[PDB]
Design an enzyme around this catalytic site. Structure first.
Site, PDB file in Angstrom:
ATOM      1  N   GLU A  22       1.185  -1.429  -0.547  1.00  0.00           N
ATOM      2  CA  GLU A  22      -0.070  -0.084  -0.008  1.00  0.00           C
ATOM      3  C   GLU A  22       1.254   1.155   0.094  1.00  0.00           C
ATOM      4  O   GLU A  22       1.824   1.202   0.454  1.00  0.00           O
ATOM      5  CB  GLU A  22      -1.717  -0.391   1.080  1.00  0.00           C
ATOM      6  CG  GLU A  22      -1.273   1.204   1.224  1.00  0.00           C
ATOM      7  CD  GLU A  22      -2.454   1.005   2.741  1.00  0.00           C
ATOM      8  OE1 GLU A  22      -3.241  -0.139   3.078  1.00  0.00           O
ATOM      9  OE2 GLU A  22      -2.886   2.062   3.358  1.00  0.00           O
TER      10      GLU A  22
ATOM     11  N   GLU B  30      -2.225  10.973   2.735  1.00  0.00           N
ATOM     12  CA  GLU B  30      -2.840  11.150   3.822  1.00  0.00           C
ATOM     13  C   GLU B  30      -2.855  12.845   4.491  1.00  0.00           C
ATOM     14  O   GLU B  30      -2.499  12.883   4.571  1.00  0.00           O
ATOM     15  CB  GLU B  30      -2.675   9.834   5.612  1.00  0.00           C
ATOM     16  CG  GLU B  30      -3.160   8.108   4.977  1.00  0.00           C
ATOM     17  CD  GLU B  30      -2.556   7.647   5.708  1.00  0.00           C
ATOM     18  OE1 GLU B  30      -1.562   7.775   6.143  1.00  0.00           O
ATOM     19  OE2 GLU B  30      -3.370   6.672   6.310  1.00  0.00           O
TER      20      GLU B  30
END
Ligand code: NA
Length: 214
Positions: free
Chosen positions: A105, A109
């Site tokens: 991943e 963010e």
């Protein structure tokens, strides 16, 4: 096997290239349940994700993802994260156990507690710990900005409005994953996200996503 280059302007819901998480919670630090009804398309062509409440301390959140998987290349997003203590607004690639692979991943963010900063991270076979917080020099919740990551075999390069802000070279992911976007409130990660005060409704907006394969 993996999808090719595309441009996604979010003019409508295209149920062949994307899907809505609905009726389950990711559990753990995710203190909300994914609802398809929280994935909306505005009249001015934006994907608008909501974090809502309809019951006492019961939070409804949202996630949208591709039906295809993608490999190396440039991933770009135009977005405006939500600003509130205890939440996350993101853009990331994900593949994992449930997809019959290792957990790989790459992330962009926005910690709601402070939208003047951005956090970059990646997971390779579930080993994270590569967090990099960048001061943006602006408040991301105020306008749309372009965030991108160039994922190649030997590196990960992150950009803000076309300017290179971070390069990672160690233990880089290699498994093709889905493109995902979500908004959620955390539980037990006060240290990291600030505690969530129950503020609702909250929204994260996305103008477009672009993928350019090698
Ligand atoms: Na758009």
């Amino acid at each position: 096997q993996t999808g090719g280059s595309f441009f996604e302007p979010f003019n409508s819901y295209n149920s062949g290239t994307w899907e809505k998480a609905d009726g389950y919670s990711n559990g753990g630090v995710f203190n909300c349940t994914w609802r398809a009804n929280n994935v909306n398309f505005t009249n001015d062509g934006k994907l608008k994700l909501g974090l809502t409440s309809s019951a006492y301390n019961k939070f409804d959140c949202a996630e949208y993802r591709s039906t295809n998987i993608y490999g190396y290349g440039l991933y770009e997003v135009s977005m405006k994260p939500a600003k509130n203590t205890g939440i996350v607004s993101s853009f990331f690639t994900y593949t994992g156990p449930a997809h019959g692979t290792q957990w790989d991943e790459i992330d962009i963010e926005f910690l709601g507690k402070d939208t003047t900063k951005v956090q970059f991270n990646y997971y390779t076979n579930g080993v994270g710990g590569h967090e990099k917080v960048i001061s943006l020099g602006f408040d991301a919740s105020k306008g749309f900005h372009t965030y991108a990551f160039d994922w190649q075999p030997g590196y990960i390069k992150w950009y803000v409005d076309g300017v290179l802000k971070h390069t990672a070279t160690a233990n880089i992911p290699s498994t093709p994953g889905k493109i995902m976007m979500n908004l959620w409130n955390g539980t037990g990660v006060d240290d990291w996200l600030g505690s969530y005060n129950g503020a609702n409704p909250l929204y994260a907006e996305y103008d477009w996503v672009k993928y350019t394969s090698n």
